[PDB]
Amino acid sequence: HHHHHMDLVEKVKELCLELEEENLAKAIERFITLTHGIEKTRGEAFAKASIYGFLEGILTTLKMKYSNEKIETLLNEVKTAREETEALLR
């Protein structure tokens, strides 16, 4: 099992609450909010790489101020989403 896309961006914003990090999550929403145009102008992979990377940033430093199973689990999940996103077919 593994979360993906908008789903994954939620399992994360979520864990941010469990960590009592309110603004952190509000930011994630404000960030994904702006990463709205990128979509059409640059394409889907570019749009995912930004967000997935941004979520990688977070889950990365959180994994320092806390040590839950969740974080690592998610971080590895998001990390996999990134690796799929940038990979090219041909």
Interacting residues with its own copies between 5 and 64 (CB under 8 A): 5-9, 21, 23-24, 27, 31-32, 35-36, 38-39, 41-62, 64
Does residue 69 interact with its own copies by CB under 8 A?
A: no
Indicate whether 74 belongs to the interface with its own copies (CB under 8 A). Answer: no
Which stretches of 2-86 are assigned E, i.e. beta strand? none
Structural contact between residues 12 and 78, judged by C-beta atoms closer than 8 angstroms = yes
Provide the minimum distance between the beta carbon of 10 and its own copies in the complex, in angstroms, as a whole number.
10
Residue 14 in contact with residue 33, Cβ under 8 Å? Answer: no
Contact status, residue 46 vs residue 87, Cβ threshold 8 Å: no
**Token output for 83:** 């690796």
Size of the site for its own copies (CB under 8 A): 53
86 near its own copies, rule: CB under 8 A? yes
Distances (CA, A) of 45 to 38, 59, 70, 81: 10, 20, 26, 11
Q: What residue ranges bind its own copies (CB under 8 A)?
A: 2, 4-9, 21, 23-24, 27, 31-32, 35-36, 38-39, 41-62, 64-65, 76, 80-90
